[PDB]
Design a protein around this ligand. Structure first.
Ligand SMILES: [Zn+2]
Ligand SMILES: [Zn+2]
Length: 1270
DNA sequence: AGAAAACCCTTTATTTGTTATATAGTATTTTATCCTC
DNA sequence: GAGGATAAAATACTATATCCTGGTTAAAGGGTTTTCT
RNA sequence: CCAAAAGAAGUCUUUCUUUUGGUAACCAGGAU
């Protein structure tokens, strides 16, 4: 394929490299541990920076100086040998080190599971002995020459043993003669007990010592014989002396080695087919741990069998050296250098190799040579992975060095740090402030930042306008900021979009494009109506500015990313550019009707006519300017430019409508006329007070029925009016506005008596500790509620605090009670309520103890957020990876499968009560079947968007369930289709044929984390979501039923015992160890003995594990289970996420199947393989005879599924880089470069959105009439 | 020709031995003990 | 009583949001070399 | 892509030619 790469890539292949490839990449051999000569500052020869090996340090300049001119090229100087070329080649040329002994690669020896110990069937514990010179290994044995010379040598060994034993027996006989002489001495002369006992003890001691010597020597020879007779390959001979005796006595019949060369010889004498066949037989028959070990072993053996690659690449004979420019040493001032920390590791290897090489030619004992080889083996291990075995090699300050593996792993590795995320030009950052004067598509950019980002564009116009002779003059002008650069700049930046970004970018709207304009200052001015999308308050936030350059990059920032084109949230479809806070207060104040205000309408009294009637809204604005009328007084006006409401338009104009100009009489306030003048012209007249809910309804109506530009302009006008009238609303905070409940003391005393009685009952022993606490807690909760109600009833309606609360602007009433009336019960560090409770408000001021017990829970709350901020991001990162390959590819798969939706179950007495969560499960879906009711014609046809009117029609017609299309049932091969996905929640129309729905789903699920409080053993928050998506076993696992029937329950001691009675009668299922600390489930009454249970009824109270429900009830049921369980948490936190996103993730969770019966297909039992591949392979196998493979659905987590991906590059960049790389190399995997991440890494256009062939190959041509007209 | 003050190299050794604030999850080797023949 | 098979425990590896700035970058010992007297 | 020196033309100060010269890892502290 390509060598220097021109981006004609089709594949990226990884595999093991042999020594012949390593010394084929090489341009030379490094054989001296030198880097640079400090005096001349020129690379030494045959060192780590030699110019002959790695190339010239200076462009077209050899080492000796004979050649210095460009004209010389492609020739190697005959004196210095340096090839005359460009110095850039030092980033490309590699050398190699020729090792004096073989050395293993630590990746295939250490990493668990050990892959050499699976290939050779050696436990790692004793493999470490072999490769580090701590034991011998038998590499070969002759097993027939043995048989023959073995009979012969058995005879010889018997001869030897008998001879030695006879010699020892003669020695014992001599000892016996000595004993007889001793007895002669004893009995001959006179010597009593002393001498007798002494001589006899000596004699018996000597006899026993001779016997012991005989026994020990016989045992040694017996060990020699026993070891020889049973000698086998791969046998570890510890006890050096044993091996020395064996090799001396029978040096033939076997060869034994030590170190990595022994493993090399073991691999050479290793046929890969017999091993594979044996492992397959053991799999088919063995069972138990033997089968579970053969299944693991067969993976690597099959990997090395299928491919043409050999396993000999595990043991190394040459080491490659990385080009110098990737491990540079740079001159720091003062004759000091900064090495790259790889030079030290290479120098250690070179030094050890040179010493070993010199110690071999010189001749030395085997001990010393083996010691040098062991140290050389340890040096290469440190070079490749420092610290994986033993103590890390440390540099200055006792800090471990950075090996080659460290350059690839973790957040600071090559992948995540440099390939997936980069630093870029034409950027800037600053602090953002509020830009209330801007339009929705504009931003304020300080002019010194703009002059720097747009430097090339201003330099061109300065020359083009003849303000500068050339580009250097224009550059000097821009650098010195002459007065005309500003006149050029404001023209240059016109209609050039700029990208603004705030970190963390949780969702899509964290980047948006605006139109820059110059402002005075150093802070970026941001529109107030984009802070909800950016999540940007003005307490010190900063944002980064990027600048598109090409024509496509500029069109994508105007047609795709412009701020005013993105008003709706892609997660749920709700508008995000609504008024909030001050704007809501201002709009709520304006459209309020104060009874008995200035200038109100007054009926005729009989002496004067009606008062308060105006001939136009321009006469009322003139009366409000005189103090004669109030903007919130009820009046009657004659409107001509505002469309009347539906009823008034029907009962006065009929015909077609008001047809602007026709006058009608309205009874309203001036503020409401002013508010309705801000809405479009054809919009009816809204006569209501603008609570935040009403504003949300209006802006949803406008977004549905009108284009985007109209909505953007309307929200801008609403912003202006809201700020203007919030300045005049009179909302301030003074302690005279914080009223206190008039009778707090009476309530608190009344409940103090109750608490006193409870305490006295406890003091009399009527109840234990916990019962008293529960009683006190109930009493004080009642007291808090009774104080809050009095507070609510005491405040007026025009108080600023309750006004801000009741307009929906911000805040709830619990915060008002805590500030004005009473705080109440507070929690422990454990979480249990303090029964005191706190009895003061923050207006009165808490005492010291109340403040302390309040801090108890305050800090718990702060720590919770501080620690969830990271878990949210980790979860989002995993969800983005699992589902990065779901893209809309077709328009219609034309399948008939689908899911059903609850859609307003029927009421008991008979009525259709709508299902509360219908907007997130039934809206924005397309029907799969037709809706027919009570023999009536099809109410709704197949394939319809199924919006609000259609749901209303279906409910009126009287149906409760519809079968809709879903991504869980899409029939397309790669990616979803458009009709199965349905409406796009952001656009409002059918999704496009390039949209990356997987990333949108991941960002929608994972963005509302942070605002997902962990809740006080069943998990109930972000941990619950994480364990749902990871398909873990729930903490509070609750068993489910397996078959219908009645249930017999024995309330045993220390644990329950439930057994299901099968109606069929085959077998009874027993659940033994169920803790009594749990509870029984209640469905419809607590679980009662003899009660009937369903096939999948949950018995205990808790969380069922998703794996069992899949095995019992099938895939549809587990899909329902997972979607419902995730939505339950999100609803409990009051977050609206449409179900199709969770359905995308769940679809990605259920792609594979598990192999139970291999049959004849090339699938190992227990492996997980893609379901489509499963069907294709079984189809290929039904031909050529019949032997289907048996498969079963499996459920995978978001990490296992994302690591089982078909691209080794994406999986290596996700997690576990070393393991993914080593097993990909062993399997010789090839990467097709078909995903988003893989194309991002190599720098190619992603296959999504604007980068697909349908849109990327458009052809534009003028029309013929336009050509003629010209 | 000998003595003193400034270079060049090595290496943080790895014992029959100088190293104790995480948890949560999974996966793979021991290992200990129990059950069977 | 011996062997095997299954729980148990014990180690081994992996992951934990984004952005910015400021201070440091080897010591110690042995052998040797060169200059001065 | 920039700096310095020399030569030529004009302007009273730009253009042409020749030569020379041209970073990271750790630890720590903050912010949203
Ligand atoms: Zn040369
Ligand atoms: Zn489909």
């Amino acid at each position: 394929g390509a060598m220097l790469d021109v981006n004609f890539f089709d594949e990226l292949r990884i595999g093991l490299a042999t020594a012949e490839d390593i010394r084929q990449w090489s341009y030379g051999e490094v054989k001296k541990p030198e880097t640079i000569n400090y005096r001349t500052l020129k690379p030494e020869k045959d060192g780590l920076f030699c110019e002959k090996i790695f190339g010239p340090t200076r462009d077209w300049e050899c080492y000796c100086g004979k050649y210095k001119r460009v004209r010389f090229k492609g020739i190697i100087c005959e004196r210095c040998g340096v090839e005359v070329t460009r110095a850039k080649v030092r980033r490309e040329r590699m050398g190699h080190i020729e090792l004096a002994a073989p050395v293993t690669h630590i990746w295939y020896f250490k990493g668990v599971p050990s892959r050499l110990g699976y290939l050779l069937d050696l436990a790692p514990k004793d493999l470490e002995k072999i490769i580090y010179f701590a034991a011998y290994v038998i590499t070969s044995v002759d097993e027939e020459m043995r048989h023959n010379e073995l009979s012969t040598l058995e005879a010889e060994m018997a001869v030897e043993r008998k001879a030695v034993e006879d010699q020892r027996d003669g020695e014992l006989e001599a000892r016996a003669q000595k004993l007889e002489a001793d007895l002669a001495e004893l009995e001959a002369e006179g010597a009593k007990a002393d001498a007798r006992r002494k001589v006899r003890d000596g004699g018996e001691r000597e006899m026993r010592q001779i016997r012991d010597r005989a026994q020990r020597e016989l045992d040694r020879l017996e060990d020699i014989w026993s070891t020889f007779t049973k000698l086998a390959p791969k046998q570890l001979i510890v006890d050096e002396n044993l091996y020395r005796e064996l090799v001396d006595r029978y040096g033939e019949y076997f060869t034994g080695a030590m170190g990595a060369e022994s493993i090399q010889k073991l691999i050479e004498n290793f046929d890969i087919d017999a091993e594979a066949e044996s492992l397959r037989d053991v799999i088919r028959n063995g069972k138990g741990q033997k089968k579970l070990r053969a299944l693991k072993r067969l993976k690597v053996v099959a990997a090395f069998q299928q491919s043409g690659n050999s396993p000999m690449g595990m043991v190394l004979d040459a080491v490659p050296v990385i080009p110098p420019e990737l491990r540079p040493m740079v001159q720091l001032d003062g004759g000091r250098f900064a090495t790259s920390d790889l030079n030290d590791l290479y120098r250690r290897v070179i030094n050890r190799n040179n010493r070993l090489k010199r110690l071999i030619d010189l001749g030395a004992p085997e001990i010393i040579v083996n010691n040098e080889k062991r140290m050389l083996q340890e040096s290469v291990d440190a070079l490749f992975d420092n610290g994986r075995r033993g103590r890390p090699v440390t540099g200055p300050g006792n800090r471990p060095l950075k090996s080659l593996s460290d350059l690839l792993k973790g957040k600071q590795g090559r992948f995540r740090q440099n390939l997936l995320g980069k630093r870029v030009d034409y950027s800037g950052r600053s602090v953002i402030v509020v830009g209330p004067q801007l339009k929705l598509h504009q931003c304020g950019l300080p002019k010194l930042m703009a002059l720097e980002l747009f430097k090339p564009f201003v330099m061109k116009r300065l020359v083009d306008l003849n303000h500068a002779q050339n580009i250097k003059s224009a550059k000097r002008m821009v650098e010195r900021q002459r007065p005309q650069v500003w006149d050029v700049l404001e023209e240059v930046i016109a209609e050039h979009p700029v990208l603004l970004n705030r970190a963390p970018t949780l969702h899509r709207l964290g980047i948006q494009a605006f139109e820059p304009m110059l402002v005075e200052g150093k802070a970026i001015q941001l529109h107030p109506l984009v802070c909800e999308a950016f999540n940007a308050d003005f307490d010190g936030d900063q944002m980064a500015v990027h600048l598109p350059l090409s024509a496509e990059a500029q069109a994508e920032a105007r047609i795709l990313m412009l701020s005013s084109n993105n008003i709706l949230s892609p997660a749920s479809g709700r508008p995000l550019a609504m008024p909030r806070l001050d704007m809501v207060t201002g709009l709520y104040y304006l459209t309020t009707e104060v009874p008995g205000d200035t200038g109100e309408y007054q009926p005729a009294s009989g002496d004067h006519p009606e008062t308060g009637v105006y001939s136009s809204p321009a006469e009322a604005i003139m009366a409000a300017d005189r103090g004669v009328l109030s903007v919130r007084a009820k009046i009657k006006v004659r409107l001509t430019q505002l469309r009347p409401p539906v009823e008034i338009e029907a009962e006065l104009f009929g015909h077609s409508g008001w047809q602007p100009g026709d006058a009608w009489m309205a009874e309203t306030t001036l503020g409401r006329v002013m508010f309705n003048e801000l809405l479009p012209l054809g919009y009816p007249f809204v006569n209501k007070q603008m609570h935040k809910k009403v504003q949300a309804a209006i802006i949803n109506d406008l977004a549905e029925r009108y284009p985007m530009i109209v909505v953007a302009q309307t929200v801008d006008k609403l912003k202006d009016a809201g700020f203007y009238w919030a300045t005049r609303s009179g909302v301030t905070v003074s302690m005279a506005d914080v009223l206190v409940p008039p009778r707090k003391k009476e309530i608190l005393d009344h409940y103090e008596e109750r608490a006193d009685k409870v305490e006295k009952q406890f003091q009399r022993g009527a109840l234990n500790h916990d019962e008293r606490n529960e009683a006190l807690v109930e009493i004080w909760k009642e007291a808090t509620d009774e104080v809050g109600q009095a507070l609510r009833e005491h405040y007026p309606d025009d108080n600023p605090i309750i006004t801000i609360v009741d307009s929906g602007a911000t805040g709830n009433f619990t915060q008002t009670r805590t500030l004005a009336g009473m705080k109440g019960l507070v929690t422990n560090p454990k979480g249990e309520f303090i029964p005191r409770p706190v009895k003061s408000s923050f207006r009165e001021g808490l005492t010291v103890l109340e403040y302390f017990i309040n801090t108890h829970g305050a800090r718990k709350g702060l720590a919770d957020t501080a620690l969830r901020t990271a878990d949210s991001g980790y979860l989002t990162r995993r969800l983005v990876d699992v589902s990065q390959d779901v893209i809309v590819r077709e328009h219609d798969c034309q399948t008939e499968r689908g899911i059903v939706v609850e859609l307003a179950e029927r009421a008991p007495d008979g009525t259709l009560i709508r299902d509360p969560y219908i907007e997130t499960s039934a809206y924005a879906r397309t029907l799969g079947t037709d809706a027919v009711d009570e023999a009536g014609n099809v109410i709704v046809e197949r394939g319809q968007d199924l919006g609000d009117p259609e749901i209303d029609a279906l409910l009126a017609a009287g149906i409760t369930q519809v079968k809709v299309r879903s991504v869980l049932t899409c029939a397309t091969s790669t990616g979803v289709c458009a009709t199965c996905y349905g409406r796009s929640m952001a656009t409002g129309k059918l999704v496009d044929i390039g949209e990356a729905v997987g990333i949108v789903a991941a960002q929608s699920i994972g963005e509302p984390g942070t605002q997902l409080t962990m809740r006080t053993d069943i998990t109930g928050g972000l941990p619950r979501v994480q364990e749902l998506f990871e398909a873990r076993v729930p903490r509070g696992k609750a068993p489910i039923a397996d078959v219908t029937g009645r249930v017999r329950l024995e309330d045993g001691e220390r644990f329950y015992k439930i057994t299901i009675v099968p109606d069929d009668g085959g077998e009874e299922v027993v659940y033994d160890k169920i803790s009594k600390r749990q509870r029984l489930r209640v469905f419809k009454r607590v679980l009662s003995d003899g009660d009937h249970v369903e096939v999948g009824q949950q018995l205990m109270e808790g969380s069922a594990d998703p794996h069992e429900v899949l095995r019992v009830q099938g895939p549809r049921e587990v899909q329902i289970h997972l979607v419902r369980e995730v939505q339950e948490v999100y609803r409990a936190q009051g977050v609206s996420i449409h179900d199709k996103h969770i359905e995308v993730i769940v679809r990605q969770m259920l792609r594979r199947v598990t192999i139970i019966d291999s049959g004849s297909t090339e699938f190992l039992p227990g492996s997980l393989i893609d379901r489509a591949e499963f069907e294709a392979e079984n189809r290929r196998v039904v031909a050529e005879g019949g032997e289907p493979a048996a498969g079963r659905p499996v459920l995978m987590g978001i990490t296992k599924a994302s690591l089982a991906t078909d691209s080794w590059l994406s999986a290596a960049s996700f997690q576990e880089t070393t393991r993914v790389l080593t097993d990909a190399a062993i399997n010789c995997r090839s990467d097709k470069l078909n995903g988003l991440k893989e194309n991002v890494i190599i720098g190619k256009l992603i296959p999504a959105g604007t980068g697909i062939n349908r849109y990327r190959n458009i052809a534009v041509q003028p029309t013929e009439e336009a050509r003629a007209a010209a």
